[PDB]
Amino acid sequence: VPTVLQKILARKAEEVAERRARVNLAEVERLARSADAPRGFANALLERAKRKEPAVIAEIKKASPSKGVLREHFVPAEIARSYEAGGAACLSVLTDVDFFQGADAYLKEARAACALPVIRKDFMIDPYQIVEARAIGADCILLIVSALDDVLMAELAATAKSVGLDVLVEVHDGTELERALKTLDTPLVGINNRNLHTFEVSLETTLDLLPEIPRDRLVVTESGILNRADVELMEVSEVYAFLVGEAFMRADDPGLELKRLFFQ
Numbered sequence: 373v374p375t376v377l378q379k380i381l382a383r384k385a386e387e388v389a390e391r392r393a394r395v396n397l398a399e400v401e402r403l404a405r406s407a408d409a410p411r412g413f414a415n416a417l418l419e420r421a422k423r424k425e426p427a428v429i430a431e432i433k434k435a436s437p438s439k440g441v442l443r444e445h446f447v448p449a450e451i452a453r454s455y456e457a458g459g460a461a462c463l464s465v466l467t468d469v470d471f472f473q474g475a476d477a478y479l480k481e482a483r484a485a486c487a488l489p490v491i492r493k494d495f496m497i498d499p500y501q502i503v504e505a506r507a508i509g510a511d512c513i514l515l516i517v518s519a520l521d522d523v524l525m526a527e528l529a530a531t532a533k534s535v536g537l538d539v540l541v542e543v544h545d546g547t548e549l550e551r552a553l554k555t556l557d558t559p560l561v562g563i564n565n566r567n568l569h570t571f572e573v574s575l576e577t578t579l580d581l582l583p584e585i586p587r588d589r590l591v592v593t594e595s596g597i598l599n600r601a602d603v604e605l606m607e608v609s610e611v612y613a614f615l616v617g618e619a620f621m622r623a624d625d626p627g628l629e630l631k632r633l634f635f636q
């Protein structure tokens with residue numbers, strides 16, 4: 373529905389077709405069976421959150437639709453190592469090329485550089501992309517409720533499980549939340565505080581949904597985390613899992629900014 377999302381998804385269908393033409397599904401499936409074992413993306417968040425410790429998914433993002441270029445000097449392996457040293461639980465690596473100035477290679481490089489699990493941050497609309505995520509070494513994929521009907525969403529999640537990927541489902545409102553909870557049993561329920569129609573950010577997007585989130589799910593609050601008051605708000609509300617990019621991409625030492633926001 374969101375205009376920018378429609379444009380991304382239209383492009384995404386083209387890119388999938390183009391890649392499938394060059395590398396067909398059977399080959400991507402062979403590469404996925406051969407990849408390094410998944411590192412346990414959900415487990416890494418769950419083991420910290422259950423101890424009331426910050427579970428930070430640190431995001432490697434060169435540019436974005438809402439902000440333009442976020443980091444001039446962009447070396448994924450170095451960002452990954454800084455993130456790990458600063459206390460991140462997992463990484464998020466944008467692999468979308470035309471809207472986030474990302475690349476699949478950035479995920480391979482970030483993952484090889486550290487021992488943390490990595491979510492492929494991209495726009496999944498086709499089982500091909502899910503199998504491909506595992507072939508490039510991802511430990512988790514992203515499903516965006518705004519972008520999917522329920523049957524397709526269940527199908528993509530089932531494809532992910534069958535290649536050993538964890539699933540992060542992202543919602544923006546109560547209607548999307550209830551579709552996600554009814555359709556998927558992943559524990560990882562991501563709430564995006566950034567409205568994709570206006571690009572406005574509200575941390576209360578997360579807080580207002582907590583009364584509908586079962587205790588067997590883990591809330592991952594996404595976007596808008598910029599300062600320590602934001603972190604305090606979430607932790608007092610018993611939100612311990614975060615997806616954060618801009619706050620770190622604007623800093624000289626991204627891992628140090630992570631330590632300053634979460635571990636002092």
Ligand SMILES: O=C(O)c1ccccc1NC[C@@H](O)[C@H](O)[C@H](O)COP(=O)(O)O
Nearest residue numbers: 436437438439594595596615616617618
């Ligand atoms: O950030 C954007 O401009 C944007 C635009 C269109 C679609 C999705 C978008 N962002 C996806 C969102 O998951 C963010 O990359 C992460 O939540 C990290 O947010 P940040 O901490 O950088 O505000």
